[PDB]
Scaffold this active site. Sequence first.
Site, short mmCIF file in Angstrom:
data_model
loop_
_atom_site.label_atom_id
_atom_site.label_comp_id
_atom_site.label_asym_id
_atom_site.label_seq_id
_atom_site.Cartn_x
_atom_site.Cartn_y
_atom_site.Cartn_z
N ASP A 1 44.77 -13.57 0.54
CA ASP A 1 45.20 -13.18 1.88
C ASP A 1 44.05 -12.44 2.59
O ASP A 1 42.92 -12.94 2.64
CB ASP A 1 46.47 -12.31 1.80
CG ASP A 1 47.14 -12.09 3.15
OD1 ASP A 1 47.83 -13.00 3.64
OD2 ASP A 1 46.98 -11.00 3.73
N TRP A 2 44.33 -11.23 3.10
CA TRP A 2 43.32 -10.44 3.80
C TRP A 2 42.20 -9.98 2.91
O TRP A 2 41.09 -9.70 3.39
CB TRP A 2 43.97 -9.26 4.52
CG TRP A 2 44.29 -9.58 5.93
CD1 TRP A 2 45.52 -9.86 6.46
CD2 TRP A 2 43.36 -9.67 7.02
NE1 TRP A 2 45.41 -10.13 7.80
CE2 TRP A 2 44.09 -10.02 8.17
CE3 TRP A 2 41.97 -9.50 7.13
CZ2 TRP A 2 43.48 -10.19 9.42
CZ3 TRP A 2 41.37 -9.67 8.37
CH2 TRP A 2 42.12 -10.01 9.50
N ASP B 1 53.79 -21.51 -1.19
CA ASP B 1 53.33 -20.69 -0.08
C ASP B 1 53.33 -21.49 1.23
O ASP B 1 52.57 -22.45 1.39
CB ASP B 1 51.92 -20.14 -0.36
CG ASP B 1 51.45 -19.14 0.70
OD1 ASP B 1 52.27 -18.67 1.52
OD2 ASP B 1 50.25 -18.82 0.71
N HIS C 1 53.31 -16.96 -1.80
CA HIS C 1 52.16 -16.32 -1.17
C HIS C 1 51.49 -15.27 -2.07
O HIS C 1 50.27 -15.25 -2.22
CB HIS C 1 52.57 -15.71 0.16
CG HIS C 1 51.43 -15.17 0.95
ND1 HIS C 1 50.27 -15.89 1.18
CD2 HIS C 1 51.26 -13.99 1.60
CE1 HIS C 1 49.45 -15.18 1.92
NE2 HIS C 1 50.03 -14.02 2.19
#
Length: 310
Positions: A124-125, A260, A289
């Site tokens: 993710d980030w 996801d 996710h």
Amino acid sequence: MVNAIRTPDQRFSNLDQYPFSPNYLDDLPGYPGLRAHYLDEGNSDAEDVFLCLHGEPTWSYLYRKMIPVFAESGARVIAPDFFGFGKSDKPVDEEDYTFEFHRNFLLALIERLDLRNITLVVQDWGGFLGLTLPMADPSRFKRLIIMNACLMTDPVTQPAFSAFVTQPADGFTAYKYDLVTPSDLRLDQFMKRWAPTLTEAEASAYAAPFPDTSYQAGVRKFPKMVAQRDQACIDISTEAISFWQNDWNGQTFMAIGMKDKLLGPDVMYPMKALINGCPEPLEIADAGHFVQEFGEQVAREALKHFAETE
């Protein structure tokens, strides 16, 4: 100087499966008076160093199942919390949170601790930011373990890294809506929705860092940054593609959470082609996710793949 608040330590009294001792840094260049939490597990003088970066809207707690496997292989593990998450101070203004605010923090951490022989673990980030780090100092990075993530570049250069924002309605659209609109955002509930296998205790551990809404400025700004990419973010992320395609010459391992709706196969295969030498991705059918929740598997397989070529 930047207005920030600190989460009472008592909020972390009963953390489920989180026996890791806290480490803090308040003397970071460009972040005066801001205390940063991070875990440093395993042999401190270990040669290999796993740098685990979390995403939205979690913290180092997300890596609780991977840290032990990495540490026992004889490696050092650094799992930091971004400002606004976990046990790190949380700036109150969303405008204080930018792409470089979080990216420059990572570079500061790396130089301060003088981390080398790094095996970057992102998602993710942690990946959006983390994947733009190696090009700033190639000699410090050795390997890479990539889980559901990509680069925040412009839509023309890579339409796959922008398409998920709008479609489908129950993907990133539903994700962002759940985070930025509620007056009373309860992260323990959000997580049980986006990570259906979490136990009641694990879910509350994700709410622990935020007593009330004033502590959630970084949590509200992250999704907005994915939808509104500023020029720095595009230029930086576009330049990183070039690094992974022509300059990267290290070992790579990729895991995809198949369920996801945000960064699944649709995004990961185009990512695999951009990363030089990236092998066939380990598909985790039951994973969503937050791939790290099925982390013990990924950690073992990654170490296995890497060990075979040591």
